[PDB]
Symmetry: D2
Subunit: 386 residues, 4 copies
């Protein structure tokens, strides 16, 4: 009954179910989880794999001998369970040294340290089989206007990503990069604040084919943007390498609710789009079980992420298969939207008197779009009323 | 006393001072202005020029003989005053035929009509000397998820802009295009909702060098974004072709307040950036005198736009010239941000033990950034307390 | 099949289905509806009744003879259909004379005119059988700080409502007033911007028992507030006299989508609360069929409002009746929330060593709240997955 | 030069300058401050006094002997410096036991513990001379709809505040309560989310004269509301007992910037209102020096709070004293707003044919309000351009 299997490609960060509940105003409400026990419990729930920051897996400051022991234990749990590691990332935000950023810190020696910390984890990610390496520049930004010259900061950001691309190509690694945007928090404003800004920045890198985006549901909604629309533009550009699924109730702090919570209808249209477009990457959940919960509530919340995806997948598929919906899509001229405006070319358009001189503007204006009937059919399908 | 001259390149849309005050809940409070009298009054205030939609200058449905008479009267007022016309645009949003968009309307015949209406005004813009042609896709979007397949819509949007680029290059016109983003209103969500989304889309056009952005202060702030940061990314990409200046109080309907109203400190950092970066284009005001005002209040509001720019220009210049500010910029390491992270290259970085193995992470973390002293110096300069 | 009947008490404003589609950027897309034909069509759909502004029913400036004819035609349509008129209101926002407000306009003669226009429609409302008279102060507010002394404005607002209460009590009318809050639009900020501000203001009126609130879904969500929470506080205070149902996608212009659109889960919790608390007033829809629609889409949208309420009513009732949900409510201690904290009194609490000196704070902190399992049960019920 | 003195009544929470910089994504960047050294440094800066949570001053779990020692050291620093303690409050949010709230936790034993923890600190506050006791219900709320029955929660909230009022009156204490609203964070939605909701709730308490509000600049702006307008309604109701001053850049996480940062023009209108209305309470700063700063930046940020208040005070006073501004206020009819609408009474209004039958609605509509000239005079004064 809406039961996930590893074939559904559901993945979770170690930092999600492992979040101890420490927020800006309160201490942790849960003990720390051993990464090995997280891998085991997620495998029992039907997950496909896990993801990690370097500092989730190897405590900061560990010696190279303790580091090998932490990786050894982790790799044994992966072999014991069949879990994969499709993505990894770097923590360039927790340690106080990163208080003004990593790649765009004003201090040059911090920027060089940030790059070396990243490169070391790229080696580990490749060793564990990760295909995508995510960068979330959570500290790249400012609280005040004079603290950061943004043109210089973008130069430094481009320099850092170009160097990472030079590193992976010189090593022969088969891994790609995905930039994860966020508009604000913990900085007052964060550089590359939306999917669009990240897509535009990638086109100025030396090797743009190596970079895509890792959009997160809640982050685009923190700017009041339509997340399915932003995902469509990422897919249109061929840049949706990875995705972070969760829930968010509007414009406020980053809630990281379980997927399906927050904006339910946006979750429906998101799943409809991902499945229609044939997205084949991981369905990754970047969420936080609320700090009200004990460990039983943690695993219930994680199970809820996958359950809600599978319910929405079923409802979206029934919606698209419904002959009455297919009729309504034609009534609203979705078929005409897919046809070229002027495949006959510019000169034919200019000579076409039916396109302007003899166009009946009042008759075209009187045509209703029938969008409300279509949207109520979508509502009926979502609610199981049809 | 903070008096503008045409050398300041202040420009106004005919639709700004000519706004009659009709909002979603109320009738017009002011009579219509003759475009000729708007040109005269703006010239008296010290403006450099005006901009127009086709339908601002030539009433919709006019015959080709009435059309020549409207252009004739307008051109005579420009000659009488010395006013320029640096930018023009198309109205693809007022007439009911555009209720589902122009370039991305679901109906193909509307899309072809939208292109023909645009091409006709491009010819007129070139005749009047405009160097930039703006596109604001105010109706390109949706209120519901199934009404618009966004990948198909982006195909149609790219097709339309590619055809416009083919037209201007085949005619030999010396004009460039600027896309004006807006996140919402009048559609529930608008395609290309921010500067970033517009910049990313331009890189997929056939002739990207012909297209840039026309960002508007209030529109990026309707998504809660930092407008100076977005302008910096546009300048970094070489794409700031034009700009719309106004004011907005946060995330709500598009207010189009006079420039300097709304977020005053963002206006200060904006002017600082435009002047430091040597932006040489028009300082265009897309604002609406509130409908509480009579015609005396209209011209007072327009004068206020230019006055506030010139006051902020003076304060920003004093800020940057202050030796104590220059000292504080070095104390916050703005100078180090401008220097390459690794001009020595990747291999040198990997072999540099001071960048990781021997990096003193606690000593670097203890360095304060001194951002608050710098920001209070900026506040003191803005308020004239220094 | 989810078919409304007049017993469901669904009502619609004449201005809702009659909205012609004129928005800040576009002309009307639909012809005007005769109020008589709106009454007939809504009755066919299963509505209980209609509501009106004075100017919806009697065009502004009508003579007293044309006024009687408009009322006569309307009353005949009500008799022909069985439709009721449970609520009426005044248009104090469309005419330019109200550009700075009605009750709080700076000009005293406008304030007196606003009161006389209101009193005249109260007489008509009582004649048609209305039990609630709504006030939406859409023009009471400001775009700038010095334009309105808010303490003086609140004095004038209290003066106006006190005079209306003196009028209805001296006439012996059995009608009550409901204030409808909105945070902004069309003014930059509107006085009494939320349910809370309106509730607080009512307690300073001379006869507070005559006044309550008419909250609107989308308006509280324009401030990012939780609409079900605000309704609960209104019910707690005994002040929910009326309600406006619609949909809104977050913090932006007032969309007035059909009910069920926008925040679907908030609509579910709203219906759960209204039905559990025994709200017996009208279920009024203040919505706008999008201007993309023709008249067939108008009535489809109106039918969708009622359909979605009835589906959500069914899902909320199944949720509350589910024994497993009742078990989960006890697991989350909703039962303990309903019990007094200290029915034993202050002195008993102070002497109770188990409340502080001997309270085991670590054992209580370790109790999980089980909120996520409860919320997934609510999701399963909403989606019909259970 | 804009130098504060204790006569300016500037106060700071111990938790403000003492914030160690630990945010949801990062560790502390500053060592803990001894409360004694904070008192000394603030006195040197010109502060009037300090405020505290119980747990700021006495570490949680301290024995009654360590508790007396912490109070002794604190009282000696107050005597050494002349600093006052005008306000105190309870920490009912940091410890995990409060994860579902204090006064409205679902668990009854937690609610009783929360009351006992509060009462103990009220005794201490009275001993230190505090006149106001603040309650910020940061954990009172929910992330999901079924977790909290809000009517039951408001019953529990009223019960708790009624018991506190019974306690202070039975002890003969001369102290009043102030509720501090916040719309969200750390809970998904917080009960009593705005000034208005708090004002309305106070009117249902048994002894309403004992309770007022402690509004915070940034918190009302997290709902996109106009903070000066909300303060005016609090003053109108006679309920502004205390105020929290800081800065916030729009709708996002609670930034707690130094006062004057964020919305500068709202800070100007706030100071204008507080000084015009004769607010005599403490000017309290609830702010966080950004975690980018070292201890030198902490004290620079604190000094900036007071400096910006004094600059804005000077500019607001010059604005109101300017004869040209006084002329413009009369031109905009601010004088008429202060005069009663109908001091002649209801019957005189009904018989006044100039108020309706013979009112010239077109002549009144044509009057411009002259708000834009007034607002540019306010801008000129704020910027020192006049
Ligand atoms: Mg997030
Ligand atoms: Mg993420
Ligand atoms: Mg605008
Ligand atoms: Mg514009
Ligand atoms: Mg509305
Ligand atoms: Mg309404
Ligand atoms: Mg705060
Ligand atoms: Mg506070």
């Amino acid at each position: 009954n809406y039961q996930p299997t590893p074939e559904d490609r559901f993945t979770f960060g170690l930092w999600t179910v492992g979040w101890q509940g420490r927020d800006p105003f309160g201490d942790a409400t849960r003990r720390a989880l051993d990464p090995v026990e997280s891998v085991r419990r997620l495998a029992e729930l039907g997950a496909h794999g896990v993801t990690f920051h370097d500092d989730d897996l190897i405590p900061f400051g560990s010696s190279d001998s303790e580091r090998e022991e932490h990786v050894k234990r982790f790799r044994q749990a992966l072999d014991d369970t069949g879990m994969k590691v499709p993505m990894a990332t770097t923590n360039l935000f927790t340690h106080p040294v990163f208080k003004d950023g990593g790649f765009t810190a004003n201090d040059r020696d911090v920027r060089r340290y940030a790059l070396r910390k990243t490169i070391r984890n790229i080696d580990l990610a490749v060793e564990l089989g990760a295909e995508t390496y995510v960068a979330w520049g959570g500290r790249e930004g400012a609280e005040s206007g004079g603290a950061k010259d943004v043109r210089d900061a973008l130069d430094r950001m481009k320099e850092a990503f170009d160097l990472l691309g030079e590193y992976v190509t010189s090593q022969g690694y088969d891994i790609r990069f995905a930039i994860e945007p966020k508009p604000n928090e913990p900085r007052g404003d964060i550089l590359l604040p939306t999917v669009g800004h990240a897509l535009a920045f990638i086109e100025r890198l030396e090797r743009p084919e190596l970079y895509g985006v890792n959009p997160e549901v809640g982050h685009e909604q923190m700017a009041g943007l339509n997340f399915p629309h932003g995902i469509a533009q990422a897919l249109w550009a061929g840049k949706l390498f990875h995705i972070d699924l969760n829930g968010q109730n509007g414009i406020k702090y980053d809630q990281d609710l379980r997927f399906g919570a927050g904006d339910l209808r946006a979750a429906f249209w998101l799943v409809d789009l991902l499945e229609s477009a044939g997205y084949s990457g991981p369905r990754h959940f970047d969420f936080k079980p609320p700090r009200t919960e004990d460990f039983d509530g943690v695993w219930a919340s994680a199970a809820g992420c996958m359950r809600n995806y599978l319910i929405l997948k079923e409802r979206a598929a029934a919606f698209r298969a419904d002959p009455e919906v297919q009729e309504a899509l034609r009534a609203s001229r979705l078929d005409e939207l897919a046809r070229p405006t002027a495949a006959d070319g510019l000169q034919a358009l200019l000579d076409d008197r039916s396109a302007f001189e003899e166009f009946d503007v009042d008759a075209a204006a009187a045509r209703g779009m029938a969008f409300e009937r279509l949207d109520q059919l979508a509502m009926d399908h979502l609610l199981g009323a049809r």
